mmCIF file with all atom_site columns, all heavy atoms in Angstrom:
data_model
loop_
_atom_site.group_PDB
_atom_site.id
_atom_site.type_symbol
_atom_site.label_atom_id
_atom_site.label_alt_id
_atom_site.label_comp_id
_atom_site.label_asym_id
_atom_site.label_entity_id
_atom_site.label_seq_id
_atom_site.pdbx_PDB_ins_code
_atom_site.Cartn_x
_atom_site.Cartn_y
_atom_site.Cartn_z
_atom_site.occupancy
_atom_site.B_iso_or_equiv
_atom_site.pdbx_formal_charge
_atom_site.auth_seq_id
_atom_site.auth_comp_id
_atom_site.auth_asym_id
_atom_site.auth_atom_id
_atom_site.pdbx_PDB_model_num
ATOM 1   N N   . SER J 1 19 ? 14.137 25.372 -1.358  1.00 74.07 ? 19 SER J N   1
ATOM 2   C CA  . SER J 1 19 ? 14.793 26.416 -2.134  1.00 74.07 ? 19 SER J CA  1
ATOM 3   C C   . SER J 1 19 ? 16.062 26.876 -1.437  1.00 74.07 ? 19 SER J C   1
ATOM 4   O O   . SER J 1 19 ? 16.246 26.648 -0.240  1.00 74.07 ? 19 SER J O   1
ATOM 5   C CB  . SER J 1 19 ? 13.889 27.631 -2.351  1.00 74.07 ? 19 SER J CB  1
ATOM 6   O OG  . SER J 1 19 ? 12.669 27.251 -2.955  1.00 74.07 ? 19 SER J OG  1
ATOM 7   N N   . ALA J 1 20 ? 16.931 27.526 -2.201  1.00 71.84 ? 20 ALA J N   1
ATOM 8   C CA  . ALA J 1 20 ? 18.127 28.150 -1.666  1.00 71.84 ? 20 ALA J CA  1
ATOM 9   C C   . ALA J 1 20 ? 18.540 29.274 -2.598  1.00 71.84 ? 20 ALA J C   1
ATOM 10  O O   . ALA J 1 20 ? 18.216 29.262 -3.788  1.00 71.84 ? 20 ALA J O   1
ATOM 11  C CB  . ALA J 1 20 ? 19.265 27.145 -1.500  1.00 71.84 ? 20 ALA J CB  1
ATOM 12  N N   . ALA J 1 21 ? 19.256 30.244 -2.050  1.00 74.26 ? 21 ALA J N   1
ATOM 13  C CA  . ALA J 1 21 ? 19.631 31.434 -2.793  1.00 74.26 ? 21 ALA J CA  1
ATOM 14  C C   . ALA J 1 21 ? 21.121 31.425 -3.088  1.00 74.26 ? 21 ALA J C   1
ATOM 15  O O   . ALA J 1 21 ? 21.898 30.678 -2.490  1.00 74.26 ? 21 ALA J O   1
ATOM 16  C CB  . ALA J 1 21 ? 19.257 32.708 -2.036  1.00 74.26 ? 21 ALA J CB  1
ATOM 17  N N   . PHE J 1 22 ? 21.506 32.276 -4.030  1.00 74.71 ? 22 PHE J N   1
ATOM 18  C CA  . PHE J 1 22 ? 22.843 32.222 -4.603  1.00 74.71 ? 22 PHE J CA  1
ATOM 19  C C   . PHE J 1 22 ? 23.074 33.539 -5.327  1.00 74.71 ? 22 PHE J C   1
ATOM 20  O O   . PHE J 1 22 ? 22.398 33.814 -6.322  1.00 74.71 ? 22 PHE J O   1
ATOM 21  C CB  . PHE J 1 22 ? 22.934 31.039 -5.550  1.00 74.71 ? 22 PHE J CB  1
ATOM 22  C CG  . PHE J 1 22 ? 24.163 31.017 -6.375  1.00 74.71 ? 22 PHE J CG  1
ATOM 23  C CD1 . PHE J 1 22 ? 25.334 30.511 -5.868  1.00 74.71 ? 22 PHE J CD1 1
ATOM 24  C CD2 . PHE J 1 22 ? 24.146 31.497 -7.665  1.00 74.71 ? 22 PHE J CD2 1
ATOM 25  C CE1 . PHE J 1 22 ? 26.467 30.482 -6.633  1.00 74.71 ? 22 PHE J CE1 1
ATOM 26  C CE2 . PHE J 1 22 ? 25.273 31.471 -8.434  1.00 74.71 ? 22 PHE J CE2 1
ATOM 27  C CZ  . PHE J 1 22 ? 26.437 30.964 -7.917  1.00 74.71 ? 22 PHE J CZ  1
ATOM 28  N N   . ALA J 1 23 ? 24.018 34.342 -4.850  1.00 74.01 ? 23 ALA J N   1
ATOM 29  C CA  . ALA J 1 23 ? 24.229 35.667 -5.410  1.00 74.01 ? 23 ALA J CA  1
ATOM 30  C C   . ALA J 1 23 ? 25.632 35.808 -5.975  1.00 74.01 ? 23 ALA J C   1
ATOM 31  O O   . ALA J 1 23 ? 26.564 35.134 -5.530  1.00 74.01 ? 23 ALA J O   1
ATOM 32  C CB  . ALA J 1 23 ? 24.004 36.753 -4.363  1.00 74.01 ? 23 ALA J CB  1
ATOM 33  N N   . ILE J 1 24 ? 25.768 36.681 -6.965  1.00 73.31 ? 24 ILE J N   1
ATOM 34  C CA  . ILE J 1 24 ? 27.059 37.136 -7.455  1.00 73.31 ? 24 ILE J CA  1
ATOM 35  C C   . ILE J 1 24 ? 27.018 38.655 -7.542  1.00 73.31 ? 24 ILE J C   1
ATOM 36  O O   . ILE J 1 24 ? 26.022 39.234 -7.990  1.00 73.31 ? 24 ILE J O   1
ATOM 37  C CB  . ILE J 1 24 ? 27.423 36.500 -8.812  1.00 73.31 ? 24 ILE J CB  1
ATOM 38  C CG1 . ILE J 1 24 ? 26.418 36.888 -9.887  1.00 73.31 ? 24 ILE J CG1 1
ATOM 39  C CG2 . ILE J 1 24 ? 27.482 34.994 -8.696  1.00 73.31 ? 24 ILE J CG2 1
ATOM 40  C CD1 . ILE J 1 24 ? 26.853 36.487 -11.267 1.00 73.31 ? 24 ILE J CD1 1
ATOM 41  N N   . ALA J 1 25 ? 28.084 39.298 -7.080  1.00 75.47 ? 25 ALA J N   1
ATOM 42  C CA  . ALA J 1 25 ? 28.128 40.747 -7.006  1.00 75.47 ? 25 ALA J CA  1
ATOM 43  C C   . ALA J 1 25 ? 28.373 41.344 -8.389  1.00 75.47 ? 25 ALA J C   1
ATOM 44  O O   . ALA J 1 25 ? 28.859 40.679 -9.307  1.00 75.47 ? 25 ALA J O   1
ATOM 45  C CB  . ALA J 1 25 ? 29.197 41.193 -6.012  1.00 75.47 ? 25 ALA J CB  1
ATOM 46  N N   . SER J 1 26 ? 28.038 42.628 -8.533  1.00 77.02 ? 26 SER J N   1
ATOM 47  C CA  . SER J 1 26 ? 28.143 43.294 -9.827  1.00 77.02 ? 26 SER J CA  1
ATOM 48  C C   . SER J 1 26 ? 29.577 43.287 -10.337 1.00 77.02 ? 26 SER J C   1
ATOM 49  O O   . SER J 1 26 ? 29.818 43.140 -11.539 1.00 77.02 ? 26 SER J O   1
ATOM 50  C CB  . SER J 1 26 ? 27.626 44.725 -9.717  1.00 77.02 ? 26 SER J CB  1
ATOM 51  O OG  . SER J 1 26 ? 28.265 45.398 -8.650  1.00 77.02 ? 26 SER J OG  1
ATOM 52  N N   . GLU J 1 27 ? 30.538 43.460 -9.431  1.00 74.11 ? 27 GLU J N   1
ATOM 53  C CA  . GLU J 1 27 ? 31.946 43.379 -9.802  1.00 74.11 ? 27 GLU J CA  1
ATOM 54  C C   . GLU J 1 27 ? 32.239 42.056 -10.499 1.00 74.11 ? 27 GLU J C   1
ATOM 55  O O   . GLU J 1 27 ? 32.757 42.024 -11.625 1.00 74.11 ? 27 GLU J O   1
ATOM 56  C CB  . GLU J 1 27 ? 32.793 43.518 -8.535  1.00 74.11 ? 27 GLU J CB  1
ATOM 57  C CG  . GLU J 1 27 ? 32.359 44.679 -7.638  1.00 74.11 ? 27 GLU J CG  1
ATOM 58  C CD  . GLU J 1 27 ? 32.875 44.568 -6.207  1.00 74.11 ? 27 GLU J CD  1
ATOM 59  O OE1 . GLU J 1 27 ? 33.528 43.558 -5.875  1.00 74.11 ? 27 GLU J OE1 1
ATOM 60  O OE2 . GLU J 1 27 ? 32.596 45.482 -5.404  1.00 74.11 ? 27 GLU J OE2 1
ATOM 61  N N   . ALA J 1 28 ? 31.861 40.951 -9.855  1.00 71.98 ? 28 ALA J N   1
ATOM 62  C CA  . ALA J 1 28 ? 32.133 39.629 -10.402 1.00 71.98 ? 28 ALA J CA  1
ATOM 63  C C   . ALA J 1 28 ? 31.346 39.391 -11.680 1.00 71.98 ? 28 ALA J C   1
ATOM 64  O O   . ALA J 1 28 ? 31.848 38.774 -12.624 1.00 71.98 ? 28 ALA J O   1
ATOM 65  C CB  . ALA J 1 28 ? 31.808 38.559 -9.362  1.00 71.98 ? 28 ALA J CB  1
ATOM 66  N N   . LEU J 1 29 ? 30.098 39.859 -11.722 1.00 69.10 ? 29 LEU J N   1
ATOM 67  C CA  . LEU J 1 29 ? 29.284 39.666 -12.916 1.00 69.10 ? 29 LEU J CA  1
ATOM 68  C C   . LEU J 1 29 ? 29.904 40.365 -14.115 1.00 69.10 ? 29 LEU J C   1
ATOM 69  O O   . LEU J 1 29 ? 29.969 39.803 -15.215 1.00 69.10 ? 29 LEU J O   1
ATOM 70  C CB  . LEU J 1 29 ? 27.867 40.174 -12.670 1.00 69.10 ? 29 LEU J CB  1
ATOM 71  C CG  . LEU J 1 29 ? 26.943 40.063 -13.875 1.00 69.10 ? 29 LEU J CG  1
ATOM 72  C CD1 . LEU J 1 29 ? 26.774 38.613 -14.264 1.00 69.10 ? 29 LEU J CD1 1
ATOM 73  C CD2 . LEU J 1 29 ? 25.604 40.691 -13.556 1.00 69.10 ? 29 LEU J CD2 1
ATOM 74  N N   . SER J 1 30 ? 30.376 41.595 -13.917 1.00 66.58 ? 30 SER J N   1
ATOM 75  C CA  . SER J 1 30 ? 31.018 42.323 -15.004 1.00 66.58 ? 30 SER J CA  1
ATOM 76  C C   . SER J 1 30 ? 32.309 41.640 -15.428 1.00 66.58 ? 30 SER J C   1
ATOM 77  O O   . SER J 1 30 ? 32.629 41.584 -16.620 1.00 66.58 ? 30 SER J O   1
ATOM 78  C CB  . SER J 1 30 ? 31.286 43.766 -14.588 1.00 66.58 ? 30 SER J CB  1
ATOM 79  O OG  . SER J 1 30 ? 32.072 44.423 -15.564 1.00 66.58 ? 30 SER J OG  1
ATOM 80  N N   . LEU J 1 31 ? 33.074 41.119 -14.464 1.00 66.82 ? 31 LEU J N   1
ATOM 81  C CA  . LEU J 1 31 ? 34.278 40.381 -14.833 1.00 66.82 ? 31 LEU J CA  1
ATOM 82  C C   . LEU J 1 31 ? 33.938 39.155 -15.669 1.00 66.82 ? 31 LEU J C   1
ATOM 83  O O   . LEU J 1 31 ? 34.597 38.875 -16.676 1.00 66.82 ? 31 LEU J O   1
ATOM 84  C CB  . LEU J 1 31 ? 35.057 39.965 -13.590 1.00 66.82 ? 31 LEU J CB  1
ATOM 85  C CG  . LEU J 1 31 ? 35.711 41.093 -12.804 1.00 66.82 ? 31 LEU J CG  1
ATOM 86  C CD1 . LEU J 1 31 ? 36.488 40.524 -11.636 1.00 66.82 ? 31 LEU J CD1 1
ATOM 87  C CD2 . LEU J 1 31 ? 36.607 41.908 -13.713 1.00 66.82 ? 31 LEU J CD2 1
ATOM 88  N N   . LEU J 1 32 ? 32.903 38.416 -15.270 1.00 66.54 ? 32 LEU J N   1
ATOM 89  C CA  . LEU J 1 32 ? 32.561 37.176 -15.954 1.00 66.54 ? 32 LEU J CA  1
ATOM 90  C C   . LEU J 1 32 ? 31.998 37.427 -17.341 1.00 66.54 ? 32 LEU J C   1
ATOM 91  O O   . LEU J 1 32 ? 32.264 36.652 -18.264 1.00 66.54 ? 32 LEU J O   1
ATOM 92  C CB  . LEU J 1 32 ? 31.562 36.384 -15.121 1.00 66.54 ? 32 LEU J CB  1
ATOM 93  C CG  . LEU J 1 32 ? 32.180 35.764 -13.879 1.00 66.54 ? 32 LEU J CG  1
ATOM 94  C CD1 . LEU J 1 32 ? 31.144 35.626 -12.792 1.00 66.54 ? 32 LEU J CD1 1
ATOM 95  C CD2 . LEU J 1 32 ? 32.764 34.418 -14.240 1.00 66.54 ? 32 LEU J CD2 1
ATOM 96  N N   . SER J 1 33 ? 31.229 38.497 -17.512 1.00 69.02 ? 33 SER J N   1
ATOM 97  C CA  . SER J 1 33 ? 30.608 38.745 -18.805 1.00 69.02 ? 33 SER J CA  1
ATOM 98  C C   . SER J 1 33 ? 31.614 39.105 -19.888 1.00 69.02 ? 33 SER J C   1
ATOM 99  O O   . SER J 1 33 ? 31.229 39.150 -21.061 1.00 69.02 ? 33 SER J O   1
ATOM 100 C CB  . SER J 1 33 ? 29.560 39.848 -18.676 1.00 69.02 ? 33 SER J CB  1
ATOM 101 O OG  . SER J 1 33 ? 28.586 39.504 -17.708 1.00 69.02 ? 33 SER J OG  1
ATOM 102 N N   . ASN J 1 34 ? 32.872 39.357 -19.530 1.00 69.97 ? 34 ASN J N   1
ATOM 103 C CA  . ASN J 1 34 ? 33.923 39.658 -20.498 1.00 69.97 ? 34 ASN J CA  1
ATOM 104 C C   . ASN J 1 34 ? 33.551 40.864 -21.353 1.00 69.97 ? 34 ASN J C   1
ATOM 105 O O   . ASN J 1 34 ? 33.689 40.861 -22.577 1.00 69.97 ? 34 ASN J O   1
ATOM 106 C CB  . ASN J 1 34 ? 34.227 38.443 -21.372 1.00 69.97 ? 34 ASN J CB  1
ATOM 107 C CG  . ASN J 1 34 ? 35.162 37.469 -20.702 1.00 69.97 ? 34 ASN J CG  1
ATOM 108 O OD1 . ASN J 1 34 ? 36.351 37.420 -21.012 1.00 69.97 ? 34 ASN J OD1 1
ATOM 109 N ND2 . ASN J 1 34 ? 34.634 36.693 -19.764 1.00 69.97 ? 34 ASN J ND2 1
ATOM 110 N N   . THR J 1 35 ? 33.057 41.904 -20.690 1.00 75.52 ? 35 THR J N   1
ATOM 111 C CA  . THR J 1 35 ? 32.714 43.137 -21.381 1.00 75.52 ? 35 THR J CA  1
ATOM 112 C C   . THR J 1 35 ? 33.875 44.122 -21.379 1.00 75.52 ? 35 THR J C   1
ATOM 113 O O   . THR J 1 35 ? 34.169 44.745 -22.402 1.00 75.52 ? 35 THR J O   1
ATOM 114 C CB  . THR J 1 35 ? 31.488 43.781 -20.734 1.00 75.52 ? 35 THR J CB  1
ATOM 115 O OG1 . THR J 1 35 ? 31.826 44.220 -19.414 1.00 75.52 ? 35 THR J OG1 1
ATOM 116 C CG2 . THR J 1 35 ? 30.351 42.785 -20.652 1.00 75.52 ? 35 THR J CG2 1
ATOM 117 N N   . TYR J 1 36 ? 34.543 44.265 -20.238 1.00 74.26 ? 36 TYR J N   1
ATOM 118 C CA  . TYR J 1 36 ? 35.575 45.278 -20.042 1.00 74.26 ? 36 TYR J CA  1
ATOM 119 C C   . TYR J 1 36 ? 36.951 44.662 -19.848 1.00 74.26 ? 36 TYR J C   1
ATOM 120 O O   . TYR J 1 36 ? 37.754 45.152 -19.051 1.00 74.26 ? 36 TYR J O   1
ATOM 121 C CB  . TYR J 1 36 ? 35.203 46.164 -18.862 1.00 74.26 ? 36 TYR J CB  1
ATOM 122 C CG  . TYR J 1 36 ? 33.845 46.796 -19.020 1.00 74.26 ? 36 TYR J CG  1
ATOM 123 C CD1 . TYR J 1 36 ? 33.019 46.997 -17.929 1.00 74.26 ? 36 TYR J CD1 1
ATOM 124 C CD2 . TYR J 1 36 ? 33.398 47.218 -20.263 1.00 74.26 ? 36 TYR J CD2 1
ATOM 125 C CE1 . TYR J 1 36 ? 31.775 47.571 -18.074 1.00 74.26 ? 36 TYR J CE1 1
ATOM 126 C CE2 . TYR J 1 36 ? 32.160 47.803 -20.415 1.00 74.26 ? 36 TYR J CE2 1
ATOM 127 C CZ  . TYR J 1 36 ? 31.354 47.982 -19.315 1.00 74.26 ? 36 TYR J CZ  1
ATOM 128 O OH  . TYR J 1 36 ? 30.115 48.563 -19.455 1.00 74.26 ? 36 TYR J OH  1
ATOM 129 N N   . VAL J 1 37 ? 37.246 43.580 -20.565 1.00 75.99 ? 37 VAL J N   1
ATOM 130 C CA  . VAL J 1 37 ? 38.568 42.976 -20.491 1.00 75.99 ? 37 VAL J CA  1
ATOM 131 C C   . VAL J 1 37 ? 39.565 43.857 -21.231 1.00 75.99 ? 37 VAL J C   1
ATOM 132 O O   . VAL J 1 37 ? 39.280 44.367 -22.322 1.00 75.99 ? 37 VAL J O   1
ATOM 133 C CB  . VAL J 1 37 ? 38.542 41.547 -21.056 1.00 75.99 ? 37 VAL J CB  1
ATOM 134 C CG1 . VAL J 1 37 ? 38.112 41.548 -22.516 1.00 75.99 ? 37 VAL J CG1 1
ATOM 135 C CG2 . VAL J 1 37 ? 39.902 40.894 -20.900 1.00 75.99 ? 37 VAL J CG2 1
ATOM 136 N N   . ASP J 1 38 ? 40.730 44.071 -20.621 1.00 76.75 ? 38 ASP J N   1
ATOM 137 C CA  . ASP J 1 38 ? 41.802 44.828 -21.249 1.00 76.75 ? 38 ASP J CA  1
ATOM 138 C C   . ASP J 1 38 ? 42.877 43.932 -21.847 1.00 76.75 ? 38 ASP J C   1
ATOM 139 O O   . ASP J 1 38 ? 43.876 44.440 -22.365 1.00 76.75 ? 38 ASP J O   1
ATOM 140 C CB  . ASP J 1 38 ? 42.419 45.809 -20.248 1.00 76.75 ? 38 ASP J CB  1
ATOM 141 C CG  . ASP J 1 38 ? 42.986 45.123 -19.016 1.00 76.75 ? 38 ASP J CG  1
ATOM 142 O OD1 . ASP J 1 38 ? 43.332 43.925 -19.080 1.00 76.75 ? 38 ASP J OD1 1
ATOM 143 O OD2 . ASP J 1 38 ? 43.097 45.798 -17.971 1.00 76.75 ? 38 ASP J OD2 1
ATOM 144 N N   . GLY J 1 39 ? 42.698 42.618 -21.785 1.00 75.04 ? 39 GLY J N   1
ATOM 145 C CA  . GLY J 1 39 ? 43.701 41.716 -22.334 1.00 75.04 ? 39 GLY J CA  1
ATOM 146 C C   . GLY J 1 39 ? 45.029 41.783 -21.618 1.00 75.04 ? 39 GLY J C   1
ATOM 147 O O   . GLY J 1 39 ? 46.086 41.719 -22.258 1.00 75.04 ? 39 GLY J O   1
#
Side-chain angles (χ1 to χ4, degrees):
Chain J
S19 304
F22 170 83
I24 62 170
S26 52
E27 313 162 357
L29 178 62
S30 172
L31 291 182
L32 288 151
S33 303
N34 278 257
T35 67
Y36 304 145
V37 60
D38 59 24

